[PDB]
Amino acid sequence: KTVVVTTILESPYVMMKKNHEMLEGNERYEGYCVDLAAEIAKHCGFKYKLTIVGDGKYGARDADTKIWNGMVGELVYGKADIAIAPLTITLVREEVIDFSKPFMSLGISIMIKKGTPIESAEDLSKQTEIAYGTLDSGSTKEFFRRSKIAVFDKMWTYMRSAEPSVFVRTAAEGVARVRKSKGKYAYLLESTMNEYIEQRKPCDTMKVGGNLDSKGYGIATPKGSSLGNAVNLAVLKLNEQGLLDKLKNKWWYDKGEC
Amino acid sequence: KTVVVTTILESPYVMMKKNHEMLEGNERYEGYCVDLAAEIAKHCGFKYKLTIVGDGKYGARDADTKIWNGMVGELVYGKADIAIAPLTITLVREEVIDFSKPFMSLGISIMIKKGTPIESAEDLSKQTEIAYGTLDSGSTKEFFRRSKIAVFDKMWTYMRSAEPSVFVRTAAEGVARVRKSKGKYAYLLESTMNEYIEQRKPCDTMKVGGNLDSKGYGIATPKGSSLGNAVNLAVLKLNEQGLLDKLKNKWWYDKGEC
Numbered sequence: 376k377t378v379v380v381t382t383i384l385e386s387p388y389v390m391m392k393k394n395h396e397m398l399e400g401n402e403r404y405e406g407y408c409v410d411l412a413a414e415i416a417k418h419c420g421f422k423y424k425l426t427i428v429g430d431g432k433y434g435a436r437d438a439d440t441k442i443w444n445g446m447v448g449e450l451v452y453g454k455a456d457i458a459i460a461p462l463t464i465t466l467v468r469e470e471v472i473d474f475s476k477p478f479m480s481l482g483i484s485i486m487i488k489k490g491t492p493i494e495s496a497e498d499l500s501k502q503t504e505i506a507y508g509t510l511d512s513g514s515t516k517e518f519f520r521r522s523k524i525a526v527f528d529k530m531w532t533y534m535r536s537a538e539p540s541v542f543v544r545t546a547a548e549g550v551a552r553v554r555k556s557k558g559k560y561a562y563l564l565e566s567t568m569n570e571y572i573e574q575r576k577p578c579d580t581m582k583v584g585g586n587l588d589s590k591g592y593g594i595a596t597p598k599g600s601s602l603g604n605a606v607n608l609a610v611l612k613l614n615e616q617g618l619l620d621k622l623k624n625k626w627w628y629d630k631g632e633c
Numbered sequence: 634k635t636v637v638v639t640t641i642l643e644s645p646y647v648m649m650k651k652n653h654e655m656l657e658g659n660e661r662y663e664g665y666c667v668d669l670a671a672e673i674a675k676h677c678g679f680k681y682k683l684t685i686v687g688d689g690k691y692g693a694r695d696a697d698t699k700i701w702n703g704m705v706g707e708l709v710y711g712k713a714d715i716a717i718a719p720l721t722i723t724l725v726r727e728e729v730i731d732f733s734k735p736f737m738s739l740g741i742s743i744m745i746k747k748g749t750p751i752e753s754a755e756d757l758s759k760q761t762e763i764a765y766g767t768l769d770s771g772s773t774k775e776f777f778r779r780s781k782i783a784v785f786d787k788m789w790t791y792m793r794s795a796e797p798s799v800f801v802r803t804a805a806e807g808v809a810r811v812r813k814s815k816g817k818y819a820y821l822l823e824s825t826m827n828e829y830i831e832q833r834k835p836c837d838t839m840k841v842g843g844n845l846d847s848k849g850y851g852i853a854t855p856k857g858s859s860l861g862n863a864v865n866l867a868v869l870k871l872n873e874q875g876l877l878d879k880l881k882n883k884w885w886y887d888k889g890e891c
């Protein structure tokens with residue numbers, strides 16, 4: 376009856392507030408998805424609890440063990456009732472869980488340290504000086520693993536065998552790795568996160584190239600859950616009334632220090 | 634058992650082929666949505682018939698008579714089995730019909746005749762020399778009718794009372810009206826159509842401003858239809874394998890004459 380919301384610490388969606396040590400409950404948190412849970416709760420008439428996904432992951436199926444990890448796994452195993460996160464709508468996920476219509480559009484993009492002589496994914500695939508990677512257990516890695524597109528296939532072959540490992544555990548770690556690597560690491564991440572960090576101190580990074588694809592974040596519920604109907608309605612209503620646009624501006628543009 | 638596909642003549646989605654008088658059946662047609670029906674049919678294993686919506690409309694509910702017109706109405710009244718069109722996912726529509734996840738992202742935009750001193754919706758709302766409108770029975774008009782945003786409210790108040798009428802029956806008529814009006818008409822339409830016409834002869838038009846909103850086209854089926862599952866799966870698969878990106882490039886960029 377209290378709705379269990381699974382979410383992920385990813386700026387600016389869900390962030391620890393400044394006085395979070397002294398705070399209790401959903402009040403420890405802020406960000407885009409924090410706000411959005413509140414709007415979705417008000418419109419659906421539920422009470423809820425924000426919970427940070429136990430393994431820190433978005434969601435992959437172990438092609439060995441066939442087990443879902445991340446927020447996807449929590450929905451699959453009935454550990455959460457809904458996921459309110461930058462969670463990418465994909466086919467393999469759509470086969471196991473329900474998604475709202477998207478609340479945000481995005482595609483994979485390239486983050487470089489300012490001055491990095493890379494304009495494109497093709498640039499990246501044509502060279503070996505600049506290492507490049509993606510996050511584990513998330514849609515971006517899967518994108519490169521399944522790509523039949525020549526350039527993205529080549530990037531995948533490189534990435535899966537690169538030493539030391541190119542993949543990172545969290546986006547924050549990818550982002551630090553571009554920042555510390557002096558131009559010798561480029562990070563493959565969604566446009567939305569890329570654009571956010573581009574407007575944050577120390578202002579040393581930038582999105583280059585076009586988006587590599589076009590996709591969306593949805594609210595996810597366990598397959599067949601009775602919440603799914605009202606939450607999808609809520610999302611479309613929130614979009615239509617201009618509330619998702621206001622919240623994007625709150626969290627990205629009014630948050631900008633560059 | 635033969636799937637009845639409702640669609641709309643809208644370039645470049647569904648267009649009469651050149652030798653169409655001599656052609657039979659689905660072979661009279663080409664475009665993005667023509668192709669996409671074929672991909673969705675192959676993946677779902679159905680045979681189908683393309684049919685152009687009888688009233689020429691996208692879909693509105695008469696707030697008088699409470700009756701759905703357009704492709705929405707054909708799905709509602711069981712006159713078609715699926716709609717494969719630039720059909721905008723909206724809440725009022727989602728309450729009556731089923732939508733796939735989006736196959737294309739877009740927002741409302743402004744089309745001007747080259748040299749028109751308009752940069753924005755705010756520009757438009759601040760003046761009366763340049764008339765401006767939208768299509769009947771479609772999501773753009775509804776957008777302006779329901780807007781509480783100051784600038785869009787003002788545009789609506791203007792538009793609903795403007796004489797002669799600002800609204801057009803078909804996008805083609807909006808587009809001609811910008812072309813013939815010498816800069817004195819600006820047309821409110823989706824970005825996707827706007828960007829298409831911007832790359833077509835006589836190259837006299839342009840998209841100005843940012844998008845006014847962020848939405849998607851979905852494949853629609855009658856509420857509860859048994860096709861809806863497989864078609865949504867097909868869309869996500871088509872997106873993921875890069876086929877929607879190829880088809881957008883086929884129909885917009887390789888079609889460009891400017």
Ligand SMILES: N[C@@H](Cn1oc(=O)[nH]c1=O)C(=O)O
Pocket residue numbers: 433434461462463464510512513514515516546563564565566568
């Ligand atoms: N939203 C992604 C997580 N992820 O965020 C990125 O910037 N890359 C990436 O894979 C997902 O749902 O898997």
Ligand SMILES: N[C@@H](Cn1oc(=O)[nH]c1=O)C(=O)O
Pocket residue numbers: 691692719720721722768770771772773774804821822823824826
């Ligand atoms: N996709 C729209 C039709 N329409 O196309 C535009 O460019 N304006 C507009 O209302 C709809 O589904 O209602």
